[PDB]
């Protein structure tokens, strides 16, 4: 069954699906010459980028989800204290705002990890940052993001730029990705990752979770967290030095390859 004129793997736009008597293998061909989903008896090829899953597919409908960050200055202290251990936004007998001090004492803050408004306490993990004496006044890690559009037909670079320069007021950083979906229809969505300048849509998008029984190979991998039992690497820079500075002049790095040493800088 096929559109008139179209043949399996033909340049003209059309569709084709039928038998290959000699090979006794079903065949399918759909799409244009440049873009197509072609399935022979041994391989399935999809030229056009494919999106699998839908935004917010596996969310809790009983309760939403949200993220927030807090930073509180919380001691009238003579000496540097030990960082809190209780994951509560007001820590164990620990103030939430900079109090008044006597001349001898000083002020120490902590860059508190991400706060969960629903639980009003530190999300699982992400303990409190190192306590540093507060003197005077106190780039962002690339992350995943999604946005809702009232009436979406295609990717909108202007909308994404307005989004970043409105929420974060600083514009996107490298490897940032934003997915835009039409309000009233999460099924229709567009995703693009910002690298260098402008947005480049990826060749494939997944919205849930990926499970692979075997191995994975890629040119490079970026993720907000990882848990690896065994890791083998020749060189390891710092994230900021690694991505922010191509020459890797500034660093705080380890070098497994060649001479092995520790450099603090």
């Amino acid at each position: 069954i096929y559109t008139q004129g179209k043949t399996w793997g033909d340049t003209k736009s059309g569709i084709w699906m039928g038998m290959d008597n000699v090979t006794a293998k079903p065949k399918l061909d759909i799409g244009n010459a440049t873009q197509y989903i072609r399935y022979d008896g041994n391989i399935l090829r999809i030229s056009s980028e494919v999106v699998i899953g839908t935004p917010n597919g596996d969310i809790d409908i009983q309760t939403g989800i949200q993220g927030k960050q807090t930073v509180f200055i919380y001691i009238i202290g003579t000496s540097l204290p030990a960082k809190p251990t209780s994951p509560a936004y007001p820590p164990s007998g620990w103030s939430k705002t900079p109090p008044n001090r006597t001349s001898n004492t000083q002020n120490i803050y902590c860059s508190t990890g991400t706060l969960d408004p629903v639980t009003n306490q530190l999300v699982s993990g992400t303990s409190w940052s190192d306590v540093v004496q507060w003197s005077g006044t106190e780039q962002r890690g690339p992350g995943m993001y999604s946005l809702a559009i009232a009436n979406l037909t295609a990717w909108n670079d202007s909308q994404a730029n307005s989004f970043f320069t409105s929420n974060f007021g600083s514009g996107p950083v490298k490897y940032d990705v934003l997915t835009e979906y039409k309000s009233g229809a999460p099924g229709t969505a567009f995703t693009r990752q910002w690298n260098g300048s402008a947005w480049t849509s990826p060749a494939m998008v997944l919205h849930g979770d990926m499970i692979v029984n075997g191995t994975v190979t890629a040119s490079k991998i970026v993720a907000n967290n990882a848990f690896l039992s065994q890791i083998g690497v020749n060189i390891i820079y710092d994230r900021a030095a690694a991505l922010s500075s191509n020459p890797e002049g500034s660093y705080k790095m380890k070098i497994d390859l060649q001479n092995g040493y520790i450099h603090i800088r």
Binding site: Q69, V71, S166
Partner: protein
């Protein structure tokens, strides 16, 4: 002559409102010692001071609120020279202008029936008709088989909320329809989901 000027008056954009949640986009501070932000919710005669000490972002969201209630939000950046007591007293800060907004109403369903698809020949497939009233976008609708009390809830529609909602793919039988609309906010990850408002009346679908 040395001084520490107060932060400029906070300017709030339109209040994006979802049930039990809120989103406020404000201006960018300019003073050199801004260390926190706060908002004074006013529901009726009750005032709640919600304070966020995170200056990194320029958007905020109140986690908890009362459904379907008009509010009043006034925000303000505060310097280091402002203490907890001073902030509570609203002394030494520039408070934002008044703004009025109302909360949203969770979706509610009026009816459910089985209708055969108008066709030119043959037995048209059944299509479920449900009338929906409320405030949301891309509300999700589910079903539960009534044969047993342990049957799973199966999603069948996440399209935009309309006065009348139709969808197919429902096997013949009796079902209890469940709805809980969703409404997002500009913020990257904040999504608002209401409770489940199931239909008290069981309905059956047949050819």
């Amino acid at each position: 002559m040395i001084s520490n000027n107060a932060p400029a008056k906070m300017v709030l954009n339109s209040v994006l409102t979802g049930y039990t949640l809120a989103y406020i986009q404000h201006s960018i501070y300019s003073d050199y010692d801004v260390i926190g932000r706060s908002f004074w919710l006013k529901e009726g005669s009750n005032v709640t001071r919600r304070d966020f000490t995170g200056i990194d972002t320029f958007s905020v969201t109140i986690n908890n609120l009362k459904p379907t209630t008009t509010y009043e939000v006034q925000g303000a950046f505060y310097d280091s020279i402002i203490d907890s007591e001073l902030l509570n007293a609203q002394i030494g800060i520039n408070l934002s202008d008044k703004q009025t907004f109302k909360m949203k109403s969770a979706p509610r369903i009026t009816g459910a029936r089985c209708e055969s698809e108008p066709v030119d020949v043959g037995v048209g497939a059944p299509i479920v008709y449900i009338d929906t009233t409320g405030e949301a976008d891309y509300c999700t609708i589910e079903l539960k088989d009534n044969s047993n009390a342990n049957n799973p809830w199966v999603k069948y529609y996440v399209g935009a909320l309309m006065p009348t909602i139709m969808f197919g793919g429902v096997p013949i039988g009796s079902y209890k329809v469940r709805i809980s609309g969703q409404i997002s906010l500009p913020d990257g990850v904040t999504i608002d989901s209401s409770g489940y408002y199931e239909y008290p009346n069981v309905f059956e679908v047949r050819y």
